[PDB]
Ligand binder design. Structure first.
Ligand SMILES: *P(=O)(O)OCC(C)(C)[C@@H](O)C(=O)NCCC(=O)NCCSC(=O)CCCCCCCCCCC
Ligand SMILES: O=C(O)CN(CCN(CC(=O)O)CC(=O)O)CC(=O)O
Ligand SMILES: Cc1ncc(COP(=O)(O)O)c(C=O)c1O
Lengths: 125, 84, 401, 75
């Protein structure tokens, strides 16, 4: 049937875009594979106190993939790097009412958060 | 064989008028188009027996259209996105 | 809420009002069992059944005695494949089909392999068309059946049915074609095509759901073991109560299709060319799946690079369509058809099927085209793969996680 | 526009530039209509102007001016 929580992230898009990969304060997570029909790019911008101040995403995938990654991008803003690390796939799925067949989307979105954070952390010595 | 021509033009008008009453966009647009196209396609038939066969078929289809228009009104639904 | 445009006729069709009109008397006053031999309710129901049988026969060039009513082309496919295989099982254990057949043909063959039969699943070329010489080479001395579908349900590509019948006839191998997507849309003649068995679905041709038929050639006689046990209805080949209203609807749909086929083909051809050319002239990286030279125009399967299929369907919220991406097709499996014609996996996640049928309008096509162009652009602007390609990156060079 | 929306209908229905649709013109003699066209034309006028045109009136509407006259005289 129609899923209003998921479609909203496409019809009312937010944080779609790119940050500057060369910045020491930007972490970039790129997860998934074209052949698996789901690729998520998630970028975070961290201030000099460790607070995530901005984030952007681009996703190739079904509507639930776009919603999972879009929600993750909203949710990291305002969280410390350590706080963002505690966002779980299950929180994302719950918020979006994902069915079991789409829980893999919320897990890839969690993988994307953690890849972006690991990219940022590697840049800080 | 009783003025085919008067039967024909009367049937043409009746069939178009009744097919405009279809509630469903896809039956309505198809019936109007098909009727226009069929009468035009058959305009130059000259054998009186073949004309009469086509006329009798049109009368039968006019009955179909009247009945289907009325049972699509009893069980109608919302319009399509493109009707707005 | 306003309803979406129906652009999914390969999935099922609406009923032709002429078909519902023919059925309605059997749903109201003519409710007799056509097997009731002692009264007028039975006699008039039997007579309607037999009239429908002739209507089906006339469309395909058959004798009415060769038409067996079934509950759908799924059942017809099971009867043809399992019935023939089981009948000649003492002398013949090999059957040939193709990798792009509908799932009921493929799964009937799989069930037979578990029964000890050998099945060759022929590959297709990137056109979607089998190689006739490879078919010839695969026929064995113990081959009982070849089954190759007339029009593909996913990509619309036409197999060389007449040429396959020549091959099979000349080697006394029975030839079955699943014609579910071709009946009443392209010419079918069982004698000119040398067809031995054929599957027919009522709901793919503006007829009601729950009914179909199987043509079983009677000269030379083709023998098949019945699958449904019972009192011997349908000459012992399909026991059960023949559903008078449904078979009336099937015969009426076949009669209408016989009269309308040429008009529909001309009109759908023009709408199909319009949809394909208008999309391809407005968007880069759009590919048609299947050879346009051997293709039924009402089934158009396009891949939109760098956009996932399900997301595009979601984006096209007021259009009813379907896609080859795995989460949309019962939610199980990716498109085996696209894989068989050699589509890259990512592009097969990017395919959409557009259906144009008897009732489709030019404005419905124009609306669909416009929305398709707008939303592919929008989803590309959301796509990390499009972003990478626009920055000159070769996706084939990336090491994916 | 004015009552010559009548002229727009005739031209659309008969495939005739608005320049050719003169008040004196006969649908058949002057504008190439046949009798299937004129059935459709009368229905087009019924639709555009929310009026019912019965057979004995339709048979008189054979020129552009007759169509203008009829519509002006029925609200
Ligand atoms: P006008 O220019 O004076 O004359 C017009 C006619 C056609 C009357 C004139 O050209 C003529 O007399 N021609 C002689 C041949 C003739 O009469 N052809 C018409 C035969 S009637 C006919 O063709 C009916 C076709 C019915 C189509 C119905 C489709 C229904 C679909 C239903 C769907 C639910
Ligand atoms: O005659 C036709 O082809 C169909 N309709 C018009 C179809 N309309 C839809 C509607 O009337 O709501 C076309 C549209 O609005 O797109 C005639 C009528 O109005 O009776
Ligand atoms: C090619 C093909 N085969 C088989 C079927 C199954 O037919 P049915 O739904 O009548 O059982 C369909 C539909 C089809 O398109």
């Amino acid at each position: 049937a129609l899923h209003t929580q998921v479609v909203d992230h496409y019809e009312n898009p937010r944080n779609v875009g790119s940050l500057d990969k060369t910045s020491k304060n930007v972490g970039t997570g790129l997860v998934g594979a074209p052949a698996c029909g789901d690729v998520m790019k998630l970028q975070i911008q961290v201030d000099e106190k460790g607070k995530i101040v901005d984030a952007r995403f681009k996703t190739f995938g079904c509507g639930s993939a776009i919603a999972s990654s879009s929600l993750a991008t909203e949710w990291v803003k305002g969280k410390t790097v350590e706080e963002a690390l505690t966002i779980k796939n299950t929180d994302i799925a719950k918020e979006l009412c994902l069915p079991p067949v789409k829980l893999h989307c919320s897990m890839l979105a969690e993988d994307a958060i953690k890849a972006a954070l690991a990219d940022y952390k590697l840049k800080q010595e | 064989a009783a003025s085919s021509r008067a039967q024909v033009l009367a049937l043409y008008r009746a069939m178009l008028r009744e097919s405009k009453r279809f509630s469903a966009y896809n039956y309505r647009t198809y019936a109007v188009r098909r009727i226009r196209d069929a009468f035009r396609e058959n305009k130059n038939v000259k054998d009186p027996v073949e004309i009469q066969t086509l006329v009798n078929k049109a009368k039968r289809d006019l009955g179909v259209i009247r009945r289907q228009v009325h049972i699509g009104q009893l069980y109608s639904t919302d319009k399509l996105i493109i009707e707005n | 809420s306003l309803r979406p445009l129906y652009m999914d006729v390969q999935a099922t069709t609406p009923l032709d009002p002429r078909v519902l009109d023919a059925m309605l008397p059997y749903l109201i006053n003519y409710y007799g069992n056509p097997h009731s031999r002692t009264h007028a309710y039975g006699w008039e129901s039997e007579a309607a059944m037999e009239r429908a049988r002739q209507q089906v026969a006339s469309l395909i060039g058959a004798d009415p005695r060769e038409i067996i009513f079934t509950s759908g082309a799924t059942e017809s496919n099971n009867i043809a494949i399992k019935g023939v295989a089981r009948f000649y099982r003492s002398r013949k254990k090999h059957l040939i089909t193709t990798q792009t057949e509908h799932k009921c043909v493929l799964d009937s063959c799989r069930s037979l392999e578990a029964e000890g039969f050998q099945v060759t699943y022929l590959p297709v070329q990137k056109s979607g068309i089998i190689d006739l010489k490879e078919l010839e080479a695969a026929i064995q001395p113990d081959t009982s059946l070849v089954s190759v579908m007339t029009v593909n349900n996913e990509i619309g590509v036409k197999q060389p049915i007449a040429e396959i019948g020549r091959i099979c006839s000349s080697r006394k191998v029975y030839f079955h074609t699943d014609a579910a997507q071709a009946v009443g849309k392209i010419p079918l003649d069982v004698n000119d095509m040398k067809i031995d068995l054929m599957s027919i679905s009522g709901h793919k041709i503006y007829g009601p759901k729950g009914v179909g038929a199987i043509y079983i050639r009677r000269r030379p006689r083709v023998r098949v073991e019945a699958l449904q046990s019972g009192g011997g209805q349908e000459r012992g080949m399909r026991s059960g109560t023949v559903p008078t209203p449904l078979v009336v609807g099937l015969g009426a749909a076949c009669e209408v299709a016989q009269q309308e086929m040429e008009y529909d083909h001309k009109r759908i051809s023009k709408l199909s060319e319009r949809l394909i050319q208008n999309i391809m002239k407005s968007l880069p990286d759009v590919v048609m799946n299947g050879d346009p030279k051997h293709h039924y125009p009402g089934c158009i399967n396009l891949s939109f690079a760098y956009v996932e299929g399900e997301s595009l369907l979601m984006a096209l919220k007021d259009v009813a369509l379907s896609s080859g991406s795995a989460c949309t097709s019962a939610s199980l499996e990716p498109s085996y058809v696209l894989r068989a014609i050699g589509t890259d996996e990512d592009l097969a996640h990017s395919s959409i099927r557009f259906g144009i049928g008897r009732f489709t309008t030019e404005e419905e096509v124009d609306y669909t085209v416009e929305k398709c162009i707008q939303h592919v652009k929008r989803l590309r602007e959301m796509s990390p793969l499009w972003e990478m390609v626009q920055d000159g990156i070769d996706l084939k060079s990336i090491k994916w996680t | 526009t004015i009552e010559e929306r009548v002229k727009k209908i005739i031209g659309e229905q008969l495939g005739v530039k608005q320049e050719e649709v003169t008040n004196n013109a006969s649908f058949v003699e002057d504008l190439g209509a046949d009798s299937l066209d004129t059935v459709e034309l009368v229905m087009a006028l019924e639709e555009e102007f929310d009026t019912e045109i019965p057979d004995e009136e339709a048979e008189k509407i054979t020129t552009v001016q007759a169509a203008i006259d009829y519509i002006n005289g029925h609200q």
